[PDB]
Design an enzyme around this catalytic site. Structure first.
Site, PDB file in Angstrom:
ATOM      1  N   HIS A   1       2.020   9.101   1.242  1.00  0.00           N
ATOM      2  CA  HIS A   1       1.034   8.916   0.181  1.00  0.00           C
ATOM      3  C   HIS A   1       1.443   9.861  -0.942  1.00  0.00           C
ATOM      4  CE1 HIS A   1      -1.708   6.926   3.125  1.00  0.00           C
ATOM      5  NE2 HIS A   1      -1.039   7.712   3.947  1.00  0.00           N
TER       6      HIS A   1
ATOM      7  N   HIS B   1       3.253  10.941   6.802  1.00  0.00           N
ATOM      8  CA  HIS B   1       2.568  10.638   8.051  1.00  0.00           C
ATOM      9  C   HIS B   1       3.526   9.997   9.047  1.00  0.00           C
ATOM     10  CE1 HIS B   1      -1.516  10.500   5.816  1.00  0.00           C
ATOM     11  NE2 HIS B   1      -1.113  11.726   6.107  1.00  0.00           N
TER      12      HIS B   1
ATOM     13  N   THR C   1      -6.454   6.747   7.589  1.00  0.00           N
ATOM     14  CA  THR C   1      -6.906   7.023   6.225  1.00  0.00           C
ATOM     15  C   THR C   1      -6.899   5.787   5.320  1.00  0.00           C
ATOM     16  OG1 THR C   1      -4.755   7.581   5.331  1.00  0.00           O
ATOM     17  CG2 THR C   1      -6.021   9.387   6.356  1.00  0.00           C
TER      18      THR C   1
ATOM     19  N   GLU D   1      -3.371  13.583   0.946  1.00  0.00           N
ATOM     20  CA  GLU D   1      -4.655  13.138   1.469  1.00  0.00           C
ATOM     21  C   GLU D   1      -5.428  14.344   1.998  1.00  0.00           C
ATOM     22  OE1 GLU D   1      -3.752   9.515   3.887  1.00  0.00           O
ATOM     23  OE2 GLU D   1      -4.617   8.653   2.046  1.00  0.00           O
TER      24      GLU D   1
ATOM     25  N   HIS E   1       0.824  -1.214   0.000  1.00  0.00           N
ATOM     26  CA  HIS E   1       0.000   0.000   0.000  1.00  0.00           C
ATOM     27  C   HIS E   1       0.860   1.267   0.000  1.00  0.00           C
ATOM     28  CE1 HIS E   1      -3.270  -2.749   0.889  1.00  0.00           C
ATOM     29  NE2 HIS E   1      -2.678  -3.117   2.010  1.00  0.00           N
TER      30      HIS E   1
ATOM     31  N   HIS F   1       5.351   6.859   6.902  1.00  0.00           N
ATOM     32  CA  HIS F   1       5.128   6.474   5.520  1.00  0.00           C
ATOM     33  C   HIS F   1       4.604   7.702   4.778  1.00  0.00           C
ATOM     34  CE1 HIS F   1       1.227   6.107   7.505  1.00  0.00           C
ATOM     35  NE2 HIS F   1       0.765   6.560   6.352  1.00  0.00           N
TER      36      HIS F   1
HETATM   37  C1  LIG Z   1      -2.092   1.082  10.437  1.00  0.00           C
HETATM   38  C2  LIG Z   1      -2.180   2.493   9.915  1.00  0.00           C
HETATM   39  C3  LIG Z   1      -1.432   3.512  10.487  1.00  0.00           C
HETATM   40  C4  LIG Z   1      -1.513   4.818  10.028  1.00  0.00           C
HETATM   41  C5  LIG Z   1      -2.367   5.113   8.976  1.00  0.00           C
HETATM   42  S1  LIG Z   1      -2.525   6.791   8.418  1.00  0.00           S
HETATM   43  N1  LIG Z   1      -2.465   6.794   6.827  1.00  0.00           N
HETATM   44  O1  LIG Z   1      -3.830   7.247   8.827  1.00  0.00           O
HETATM   45  O2  LIG Z   1      -1.394   7.505   8.924  1.00  0.00           O
HETATM   46  C6  LIG Z   1      -3.118   4.115   8.381  1.00  0.00           C
HETATM   47  C7  LIG Z   1      -3.016   2.817   8.856  1.00  0.00           C
HETATM   48 ZN   LIG Z   2      -0.924   7.624   6.000  1.00  0.00          ZN
END
Ligand SMILES: Cc1ccc(S(N)(=O)=O)cc1
Ligand SMILES: [Zn+2]
Ligand SMILES: Cc1ccc(S(N)(=O)=O)cc1
Length: 257
Positions: free
Chosen positions: A93, A116, A195, A103, A61, A91
């Site tokens: 996006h 993030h 998200t 996002e 992902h 990570h």
């Molecule tokens: C397990 C997980 C951790 C963090 C996110 S996020 N994109 O909202 O930072 C999504 C899933």
């Molecule tokens: Zn994220």
């Protein structure tokens, strides 16, 4: 089996994760003229000097840079937060083109990407317990625009060739996440969710106002990653973002006047 394609993307998620249509979903559009300065917010404290990175993983992902969270080594405190939140991973996006990928949006503007930094509230003991709580997580979100290179990102960029496909990981020790921050810690904050599935409504979002700049070459290398596993037909890992969701009964607060 969820993903970002036409047949398994954000429009489909609600069928297996009904909270997708919930009351505090993320991301959202940040309407800067509706957000209000909040004098009750305490100074934000990003304390990453003792951060211990371990590994980088392509999870099909995105890619996660994982940290040792067995002690208070890298933590986020202050701002809207009560107590101490420990860094577990970061990570990104990103898009297929520079004009999309983030996002969150700012007055409907989409950035090229969004970082993030994910933290869990230490009062709950572990990440799994934290995601059963309305104040379990804090995610520090940082926008990326394309311009000059971000020196602190290059080590990440250079390791991506070794984790091209889903399930691949590599050692990623001694990485300093402080090199990914902008100068200013001015932010917006609101209560939201993960998200991606499972879309759990556990997150205090802290979204920095100042983007970081990364080079075209840096983001181009993100776009060479694969959603698929080794030996499978190539699907470029691009457009791994969820669009803005309804704000509903929420207020976005600003840390700055
Ligand atoms: C397990 C997980 C951790 C963090 C996110 S996020 N994109 O909202 O930072 C999504 C899933
Ligand atoms: Zn994220
Ligand atoms: C990568 C990095 C940049 C800046 C600092 S500071 N706040 O000590 O000037 C520390 C680490």
């Amino acid at each position: 089996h969820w993903g970002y394609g036409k047949h398994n993307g954000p429009e489909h998620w609600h069928k297996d994760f009904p909270i997708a249509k919930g009351e505090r979903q993320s991301p959202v559009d940040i309407d800067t003229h509706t957000a209000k300065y909040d004098p009750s917010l305490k100074p934000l404290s990003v304390s990453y000097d003792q951060a211990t990175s371990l590994r980088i993983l392509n999870n099909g992902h995105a890619f996660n840079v994982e940290f040792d969270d067995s002690q208070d080594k890298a933590v986020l405190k202050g701002g809207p937060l009560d107590g101490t939140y420990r860094l577990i991973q970061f990570h990104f996006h990103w898009g297929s083109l520079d004009g999309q990928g983030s996002e969150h949006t700012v007055d409907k503007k989409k950035y090229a990407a969004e970082l993030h930094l994910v933290h869990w509230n230490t009062k709950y003991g572990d990440f799994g317990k934290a995601v059963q709580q309305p104040d379990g997580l804090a995610v520090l979100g940082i926008f990326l625009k394309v311009g000059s290179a971000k020196p602190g990102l290059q080590k990440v960029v250079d390791v991506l060739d070794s984790i091209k496909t889903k399930g691949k990981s590599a050692d990623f020790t001694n990485f300093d996440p402080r090199g990914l921050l902008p100068e200013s810690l001015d932010y917006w904050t609101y209560p939201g969710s993960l998200t991606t599935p499972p879309l759990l409504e556990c997150v205090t979002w802290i979204v920095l106002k100042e983007p970081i700049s990364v080079s075209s070459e840096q983001v181009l290398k993100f776009r060479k990653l694969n959603f698929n596993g080794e030996g499978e037909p190539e699907e470029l890992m691009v457009d791994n973002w969820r669009p803005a969701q309804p704000l509903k009964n929420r207020q976005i607060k600003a840390s700055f006047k």
